[PDB]
Amino acid sequence: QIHACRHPKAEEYFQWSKLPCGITSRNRIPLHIISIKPSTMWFGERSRKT
Amino acid sequence: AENFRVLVKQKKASFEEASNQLINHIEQFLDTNETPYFMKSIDCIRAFREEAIKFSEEQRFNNFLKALQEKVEIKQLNHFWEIVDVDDLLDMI
Amino acid sequence: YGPDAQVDRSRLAAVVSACKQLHRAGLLHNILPSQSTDLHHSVGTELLSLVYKGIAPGDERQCLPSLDLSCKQLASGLLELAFAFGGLCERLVSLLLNPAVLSTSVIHFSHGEYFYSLFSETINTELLKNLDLAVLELMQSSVDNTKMVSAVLNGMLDQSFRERANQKHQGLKLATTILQHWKKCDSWWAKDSPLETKMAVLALLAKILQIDSSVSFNTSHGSFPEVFTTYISLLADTKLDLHLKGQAVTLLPFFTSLTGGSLEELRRVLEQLIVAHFPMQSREFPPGTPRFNNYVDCMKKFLDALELSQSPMLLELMTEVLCREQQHVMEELFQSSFRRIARRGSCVTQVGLLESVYEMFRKDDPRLSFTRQSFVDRSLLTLLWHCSLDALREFFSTIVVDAIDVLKSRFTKLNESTFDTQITKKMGYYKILDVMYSRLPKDDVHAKESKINQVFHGSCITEGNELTKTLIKLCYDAFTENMAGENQLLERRRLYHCAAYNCAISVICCVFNELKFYQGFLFSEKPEKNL
Numbered sequence A: 001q002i003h004a005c006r007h008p009k010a011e012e013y014f015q016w017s018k019l020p021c022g023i024t025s026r027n028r029i030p031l032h033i034i035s036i037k038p039s040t041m042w043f044g045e046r047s048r049k050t
Numbered sequence B: 001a002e003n004f005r006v007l008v009k010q011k012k013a014s015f016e017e018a019s020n021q022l023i024n025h026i027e028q029f030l031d032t033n034e035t036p037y038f039m040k041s042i043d044c045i046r047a048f049r050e051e052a053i054k055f056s057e058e059q060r061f062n063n064f065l066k067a068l069q070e071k072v073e074i075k076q077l078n079h080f081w082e083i084v085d086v087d088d089l090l091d092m093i
Numbered sequence C: 001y002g003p004d005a006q007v008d009r010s011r012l013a014a015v016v017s018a019c020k021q022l023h024r025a026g027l028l029h030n031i032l033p034s035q036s037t038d039l040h041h042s043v044g045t046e047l048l049s050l051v052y053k054g055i056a057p058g059d060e061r062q063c064l065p066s067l068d069l070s071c072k073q074l075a076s077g078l079l080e081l082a083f084a085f086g087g088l089c090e091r092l093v094s095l096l097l098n099p100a101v102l103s104t105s106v107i108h109f110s111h112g113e114y115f116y117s118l119f120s121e122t123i124n125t126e127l128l129k130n131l132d133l134a135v136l137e138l139m140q141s142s143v144d145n146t147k148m149v150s151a152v153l154n155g156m157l158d159q160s161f162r163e164r165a166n167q168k169h170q171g172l173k174l175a176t177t178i179l180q181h182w183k184k185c186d187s188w189w190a191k192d193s194p195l196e197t198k199m200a201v202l203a204l205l206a207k208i209l210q211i212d213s214s215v216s217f218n219t220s221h222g223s224f225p226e227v228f229t230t231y232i233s234l235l236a237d238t239k240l241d242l243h244l245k246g247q248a249v250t251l252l253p254f255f256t257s258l259t260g261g262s263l264e265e266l267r268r269v270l271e272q273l274i275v276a277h278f279p280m281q282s283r284e285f286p287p288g289t290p291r292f293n294n295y296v297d298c299m300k301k302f303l304d305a306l307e308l309s310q311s312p313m314l315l316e317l318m319t320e321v322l323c324r325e326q327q328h329v330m331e332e333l334f335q336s337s338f339r340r341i342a343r344r345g346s347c348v349t350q351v352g353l354l355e356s357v358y359e360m361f362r363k364d365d366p367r368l369s370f371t372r373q374s375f376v377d378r379s380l381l382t383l384l385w386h387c388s389l390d391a392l393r394e395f396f397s398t399i400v401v402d403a404i405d406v407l408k409s410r411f412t413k414l415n416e417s418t419f420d421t422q423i424t425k426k427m428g429y430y431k432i433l434d435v436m437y438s439r440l441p442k443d444d445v446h447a448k449e450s451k452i453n454q455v456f457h458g459s460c461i462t463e464g465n466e467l468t469k470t471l472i473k474l475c476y477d478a479f480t481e482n483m484a485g486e487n488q489l490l491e492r493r494r495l496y497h498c499a500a501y502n503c504a505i506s507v508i509c510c511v512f513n514e515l516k517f518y519q520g521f522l523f524s525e526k527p528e529k530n531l
Ligand SMILES: [Zn+2]
Pocket: A003, A004, A005, A019, A020, A021
């Protein structure tokens, strides 16, 4: 379930509901994916309480 | 049944997974002696039967159709088939 | 005028205050002309039509103007001035139901609804003095809209709730005139009525119970067949949501005091509600899901209603929905409510609750042995642990006779594998004896007392060495029973052994102080063959 694979074009893959790894569904049942991006520079540009 | 029958449409293409919870949905319904539970157990069984008329479940449907009635053989459930002071104590020591 | 002509509206407010002073002094009819058939009526209707058609009947093209604080009180004073002339409450309530459409940021609705929402503190303020001739007409000739009449009634109820200062008689008059007219509004609650009127009648039912004291409505005193059937039809509404059924069952303690088949019908509808709403495991709704929030809210509201009512009516359903699951997330609040309802009411209340749960768990209903266990050990144990005094003795005298009658030798049917129910009842009786002996003092249960004679036949001159002796023999033969042959229900019979041993510990530590009995009972193991 938990994935941390990397790919240069992983953004478009996630947009197409596909992990960076070539697998997109198991047993022909579609997967529901959410992306968590741990970073800090994005928070340093907020204008209000976050 | 009416609550867990939406997953089998397109989301979970494997009916094996959603069948277990649908079967469990009536287990505790059979135990409670109250009448509304008895009146709504058959309602969920009818929805469980409804899937084999449009999904072609009969390859695995009769395998549980007989098991659900054989589970009655262990119980009784004859109404469920209707739808189908010291010295004296020192002595004994 | 807009926000710049303050002098005109100030002079208008001044002259309106002058007119009100003349009215309260008794000179309004003598200053303003009132020497015709409808002269004062003419000026009153003129002021009312002005304040009604000044907002936005004539600017249906661009927009409605904003009413600032200067006009918010000016029109509120003009309303009282117009109403001070005569009894035009009928004309006002006729102007209330005005099925127009405001053209406006775009909120289209009735013009009378806007007129009411602007000055909702004036119509209800003036209608309390002229009650019947207005409320009868607004109840009869307004069933077509089913919205405005509900709003004005809610406003009048709120005013009466605020008018409890030395004038609660007006609220009782409202209660009487609405209980004698519930028959005139049998169209609000139907199988096709929208949810708006359902919420309206639910708020009405909520507010009337606090505006109608129990003196006029206790049991079939205020025409129960109407209100009770209305509430039952409200509960039976399937298209209705659950968040409002929360308040619907929150107003339950008013209907708990019934005695006839009406309480049975309420039981049936509550069972049909909980079987259609509550899940089986309460785990399909994770925290954060709105279903989980509605579930926990309705559960805590049921618990609070049971606590306020202390009724033996729905504690059976509460215990059933508690014990039909192995471990519920609301267990702590359940136990708190149990302790509170045990400690709140008089002895007879907790006695009735204990008798109800005892009848529930003792009868031969075809339920699982684990369900009956959960029942007793979760409800009756805690109730007896937190029950008040002068009740354990009576519950003892009532139950222990049949308890020891069943406990003695009724160990049969070793073939149908249903022995689990019997041994579950046995261990439940043992736990009851344990919890009742854990609280009774020394001389209360071992000296010359009445319940000891109740256990025996008539008065027993002995100190009481019959019930204690029989209990000791039973528990000893229970936890010393060898299991070399019986290999069918080892786990349930082991739990039975543990319960019997705990009961023995309790009944021995209660009254026995000599260390001889300690050994001779709890430690005198005699390994003859398998003992
Ligand atoms: Zn991966």
